Write a protein that binds this DNA or RNA. Structure first.
Lengths: 82, 137, 119, 94, 175, 59, 47
RNA sequence: UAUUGGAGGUAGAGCACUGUUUGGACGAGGGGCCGGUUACCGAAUUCAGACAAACUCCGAAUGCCAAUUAAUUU
RNA sequence: CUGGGGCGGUCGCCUCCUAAAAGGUAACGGAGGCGCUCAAAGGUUCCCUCAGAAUGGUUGGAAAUCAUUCAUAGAGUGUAAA
RNA sequence: UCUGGUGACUAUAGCAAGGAGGUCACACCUGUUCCCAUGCCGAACACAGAAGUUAAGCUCCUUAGCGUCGAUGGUAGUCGAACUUACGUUCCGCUAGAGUAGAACGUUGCCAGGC
C-alpha cells in the first residue's frame, strides 16, 4: 500500500438540500418553503417572505407562481383563490 | 510554444479527445497551412521539434505561425509505486487537437518550399495531416 | 468644472427607495407629494390597481392664493382629506416622495392628519 | 451570372440534407428587400463557376420558378476536411 | 463686494461679447474654490495639522476639514484614515473678497516672472497649482508660522475648459 | 463658508498707499487707523506693497 | 472573551446569558432587559 | 403518455468577467544617454486569432417538480 | 481507515469543483478554511455612493491628501470559498 | 396627441449627436432674518421671495454612429433506435451558441388642469 505519499485535500462538508421545494401550480399551505437558497437567486414577491437564512416561505395559503422581475432577476408569488 | 508561464490549478482533469475542432479551422495569418485529420495530444515538445525542422529548412526565409499552444498539464506517477496515495506530478504540457484544427501556418515563401517544410514537420508529429492554402472564393 | 442638476432626479431615487415598502392598497391607499420650486401636489393612489382615487394641488384654483408655500401646503393637505372622506378613505400611508419629512411635506401631512385621515 | 436553383420543401430531415449534400448540389436560402424567406438548393459546380466568374460580390441572376432575382452572396458555409460547400445565404438588392 | 460688483457690470459686460452667447445665462460664472492644504508628513507629527488648521482658518474665513487617507499607503505612514492635509470651500461673497485679496497680494511676495502663473492646469479649467505659502497670510506675519506649504487650488466655474479659464483670468489676474 | 462654528471674518479696508486697494478681506481685525467710509471702517492692515506699484511686467 | 450572566438589579434573578471581551469592556457591562417576574424592563448588570 | 407552467447552468458554443495565450497596429514610462533622444522593455489602447473541472454575456437534448386537466393501465 | 500489513497521513464541522443543468452521489480525488470575532462590525430612523484611469499637479517613492469627466461595479461586505 | 404627476412592461424603453421650445405648469434665480441646516459650505437641506432668463437640467422632434433586440436556413450537441469497438456509423424526433437579413430613437394605465 504505497508508503508515505500523502495528500492535503481529502475534506468536504455535508451538502444542504437547497434548490426548489414546490412547483408552479400546486397548493402550498402557508409556511411552505419554496426555495432554499443563499443570497437571492429568487426574491420574495406577493405573500412571500424572506427567512434569516435567505429561505423563501409562503405567507398564506394558495397556489405558487414563479415569474420574472426585471431583466436578470426572478421573484416568487402566492395567490389564494382555491 | 512550450509552456504556459503560470496556470491557476496545476493538477487538472485530462482533456476530452472526442468530437470536432472548436475553431482555428482556417488559415488567417499565413498563406498556406497544415491541418490535422485525426485527434491526438500534442506535448509541447513535438511542436518544438516541428517548428525547428520547418524554420531551419527554410533557411531563415519566410514567416511561421504556430497555431497550437500547449495549455494542459499532464501528470505521471513516480516509478514503481502502487495505486492510490494522491495524484502524481506534472510531466509535460499538452494541447489536444481535433480533425480540422489548423496547426501551422507559413507565408512569404514559394508554394513548393512551404509544402516540403510542412511535410517535414508532419513526420515529427503524431497526427495525420493535410496541406491547405488560404481559403478564398 | 462641475454641472449643477435639477433636484428632481435625485428626488425620484429616494421616492422609489421609500416606495419599496410603501404600496397603496384599496383599504390603505398611498398619499404622494410632488413639490415644485413654486407648488405642491398630492394624490391618493391604490397601487394594486394603478388608480388615483383623489387629488389636490396648490395650483387647483380652489386653493390657489397668496401665501408662504408652507401655508398653502396646509391647504393642499386639508383639501385632500375632504376629497378622501367623500370616497370613504380613513387610513392612508404617507409617501413623502423623496423629500425629507420637514417643512412643506410635513405641513401637508400634519394638515391631513388634523382633518381626519388616520395616519 | 445566371445561376438557377430549385425550391426546397418542408421538414427536410438530416438524412435528406446529407444525401442532398452528397450529390453535386448544396442547400441555400434567400432573403432581403424585394422578396421573402425562400429556401432553395443550387448545384455546387455552377455556383463555383459563377463565383470565380464574378468574384466575391456580384449582382447575380438567380433562377427560382420563373422569376430571376438580382442577388448577391451575403455570406457562406464550408467543410475544411472533405472539401465541400455547405450552406449559402443570399440577399436581394433589386 | 468688489469683484462682485465688477462681475455684473464688467465681466458680464466684457466676456458676453468677447465670446457670443445667445442668452445672458450662458455666461461663465465662478462657483467656488477648494483650498486643500495637500499633504504634509504628519506621521510622526500631528502638530503640523492644527497649525495647518491655523492657516486657512486664519487666511480664509473657515477651518480646514482634515480628510483622512482613503487607502493605506506605504513609503510614508498613511494608514487607512491617517488624518492628513486639509479642505476649505469658498462659495458666497467670500469667494470674491478672498479672490480679490489674492490678486491684490500676489505680486509682492510671489516674485512670479509672469506675475501669478502659467499653464499649470489639469486641462479642463482648474488651477491644480501650488504655492509655497509666500503670498498668503499677509495679515498674519511669516513670523508666527513654522512651515512652507502649498494648496491644491482649483477653479470651479460654469466655464467649459481651461481655454476659457484664461479669459476669466482676465478677471484681474495674470495669464 | 463652512458655517456653524465658523471663525470671524470681515471685509476690511486694505487702504494701502499703493492705490488704496481696499477691496480685500481677512481676519486682520486691527485698529482702524483710517476710519473712512468709501472703504471699510476697519484696519488698513496693508501698509506697503508692490501689487499696485512695481510689477516685473508692468513696473 | 468570557461568558456573562446578567442579573436584574431590582428582582435579583439571573435571567440572561451573553458574552463580552474582558479587555475592550473590562467593566461589568450593564443594560436594560425584561425581568419576567416583574413584567417590566429593569437594569441588568453582569453581576 | 399527450398537453401546459416552472427551478436549474451539463453537452455545445463563446471570450463580456477571472484568467491562459499567437501574430499585427499604435503612442508612450524606468531606461540605452545627458528629463532625456533611439532601441526597447513594463504595461496603457486597439485589430485578427485561440484554450479552461474548479471562466461564463449565452445555452440545449433529456431528466426532475407540479397542474384547470385528458386518454390507457393497475 | 489503509489497493496486504507495517511507516507516513487521516478522523468532527463549513465552502468549492469532480457531480453527468432538481435533489443526492465515492476514492489515501483536485483546492481552501473553523474550534472565533462584534457593546458596535447588533436594532431602528435619516442621509451618502465605489475601485481604477487619464486630461495633474504643493508633496509627487509612481499613485500618500487634494481636483475633474468616465467609471456596472472592475470596489467594499470582520474572516475560507461560493 | 400635447402638459405635469403617478406606475406597467426583458434597454424595440438606453447613450451620443443635431435641432427646437419655454404657454405660465417645469427648472433657473434674490438672499439667510425667520424653523432648519451641514464630523466640514444657504453647496445641498430647509426657508422667505420671484425682479432676471432659457442657457442648461427638463420637454418635444430627427438620426441607427452607439445600445439593445433578432428570425428563416443551417451547423454543433443530444433523447430513443439499429449497427457496432470505431478518438465511431446510420435513422428519427428535439434543436442551440455564434453569425447574417432585419425590428428598433418605445408602448401604456389612472388622475388633474389642456386643446
Amino acid at each position: 500500500k504505497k508508503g508515505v505519499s500523502s495528500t492535503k485535500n481529502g475534506r468536504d462538508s455535508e451538502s444542504k438540500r437547497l434548490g426548489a421545494k414546490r412547483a408552479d401550480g400546486q397548493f402550498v399551505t402557508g409556511g411552505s418553503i419554496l426555495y432554499r437558497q443563499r443570497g437571492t437567486k429568487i426574491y420574495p414577491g406577493e405573500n412571500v417572505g424572506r427567512g434569516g437564512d435567505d429561505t423563501l416561505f409562503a405567507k398564506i395559503d394558495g397556489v405558487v407562481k414563479f415569474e420574472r422581475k426585471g431583466r436578470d432577476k426572478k421573484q416568487v408569488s402566492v395567490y389564494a383563490v382555491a | 510554444m512550450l509552456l504556459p508561464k503560470r496556470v491557476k490549478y496545476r493538477r487538472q482533469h485530462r482533456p476530452k479527445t472526442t468530437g470536432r475542432s472548436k475553431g482555428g479551422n482556417y488559415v488567417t495569418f499565413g498563406e498556406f497551412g497544415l491541418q490535422a485529420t485525426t485527434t491526438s495530444w500534442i506535448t509541447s515538445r513535438q511542436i518544438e521539434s516541428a517548428r525547428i525542422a520547418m524554420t531551419r529548412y527554410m533557411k531563415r526565409g519566410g514567416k511561421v505561425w504556430i497555431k497550437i499552444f500547449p495549455h494542459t498539464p499532464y501528470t505521471k506517477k513516480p516509478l514503481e509505486v502502487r495505486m492510490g496515495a494522491g495524484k502524481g506530478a506534472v510531466e509535460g504540457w499538452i494541447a489536444v487537437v481535433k480533425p480540422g484544427r489548423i496547426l501551422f501556418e507559413v507565408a512569404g515563401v514559394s508554394e513548393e518550399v512551404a509544402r516540403e517544410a510542412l511535410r517535414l514537420a508532419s513526420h515529427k508529429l503524431p497526427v495525420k495531416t493535410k496541406f491547405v492554402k488560404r481559403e478564398e472564393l | 468644472m462641475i454641472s449643477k442638476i435639477d433636484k428632481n432626479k435625485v428626488r425620484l431615487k429616494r421616492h422609489a427607495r421609500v416606495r419599496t415598502n410603501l404600496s397603496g392598497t384599496a383599504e390603505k391607499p398611498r398619499l404622494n407629494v410632488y413639490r415644485s420650486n413654486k407648488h405642491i401636489y398630492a394624490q391618493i393612489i391604490d397601487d394594486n390597481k394603478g388608480v388615483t382615487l383623489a387629488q389636490a394641488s396648490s395650483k387647483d384654483s380652489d386653493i390657489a392664493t397668496t401665501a408662504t408655500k408652507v401655508e398653502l401646503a396646509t391647504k393642499v393637505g386639508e383639501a385632500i382629506a375632504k376629497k378622501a372622506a367623500d370616497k370613504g378613505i380613513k387610513e392612508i400611508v404617507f409617501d413623502r416622495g423623496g423629500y425629507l419629512y420637514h417643512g412643506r411635506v410635513k405641513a401637508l401631512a400634519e394638515a391631513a392628519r388634523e382633518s381626519g385621515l388616520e395616519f | 451570372a445566371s445561376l438557377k436553383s430549385i425550391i426546397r420543401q418542408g421538414k427536410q430531415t438530416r438524412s435528406d440534407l446529407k444525401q442532398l449534400r452528397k450529390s453535386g448540389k448544396v442547400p441555400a436560402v434567400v432573403y432581403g428587400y424585394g422578396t421573402k424567406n425562400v429556401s432553395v438548393k443550387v448545384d455546387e459546380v455552377e455556383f463555383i463557376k459563377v463565383i470565380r466568374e464574378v468574384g466575391r460580390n456580384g449582382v447575380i441572376e438567380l433562377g427560382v420558378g420563373s422569376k430571376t432575382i438580382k442577388v448577391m452572396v451575403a455570406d457562406y458555409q464550408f467543410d475544411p476536411l472533405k472539401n465541400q460547400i455547405t450552406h449559402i445565404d443570399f440577399l436581394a438588392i433589386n | 463686494n468688489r469683484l462682485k460688483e465688477k462681475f455684473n457690470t464688467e465681466v458680464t459686460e466684457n466676456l458676453m461679447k468677447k465670446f457670443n452667447y445667445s442668452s445672458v445665462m450662458e455666461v461663465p460664472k465662478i462657483d467656488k474654490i477648494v483650498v486643500n492644504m495637500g499633504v504634509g508628513d504628519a506621521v510622526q507629527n500631528s502638530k503640523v495639522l492644527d497649525n495647518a488648521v491655523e492657516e486657512l482658518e486664519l487666511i480664509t474665513g473657515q477651518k480646514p476639514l482634515v480628510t483622512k487617507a482613503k487607502k493605506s499607503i506605504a513609503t510614508f505612514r498613511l494608514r487607512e484614515g491617517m488624518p492628513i492635509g486639509a479642505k476649505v470651500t469658498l462659495r458666497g461673497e467670500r469667494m470674491y473678497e478672498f479672490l480679490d485679496k489674492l490678486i491684490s497680494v500676489s505680486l509682492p511676495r510671489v516674485r512670479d516672472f509672469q506675475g501669478v502663473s502659467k499653464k499649470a492646469f489639469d486641462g479642463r479649467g482648474n488651477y491644480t497649482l501650488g504655492v509655497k505659502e509666500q503670498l498668503i497670510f499677509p495679515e498674519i506675519d511669516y513670523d508666527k508660522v513654522s512651515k512652507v506649504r502649498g494648496m491644491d487650488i482649483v477653479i470651479v466655474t460654469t466655464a467649459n475648459t481651461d481655454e476659457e479659464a484664461r479669459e476669466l483670468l482676465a478677471n484681474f489676474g495674470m495669464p | 463658508m463652512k458655517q456653524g462654528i465658523h471663525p470671524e471674518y470681515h471685509q476690511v479696508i486694505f487702504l494701502d498707499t499703493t492705490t488704496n486697494f481696499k477691496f480685500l478681506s481677512g481676519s486682520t481685525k486691527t485698529s482702524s487707523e483710517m476710519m473712512e467710509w468709501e472703504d471699510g471702517k476697519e484696519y488698513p492692515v496693508i501698509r506697503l506693497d508692490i501689487s499696485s506699484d512695481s510689477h516685473p511686467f508692468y513696473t | 472573551r468570557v461568558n456573562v450572566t446578567l442579573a436584574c438589579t431590582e428582582c435579583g434573578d439571573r435571567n440572561y446569558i451573553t458574552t463580552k471581551n474582558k479587555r475592550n469592556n473590562p467593566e461589568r457591562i450593564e443594560m436594560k432587559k425584561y425581568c419576567p417576574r416583574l413584567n417590566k424592563y429593569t437594569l441588568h448588570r453582569e453581576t
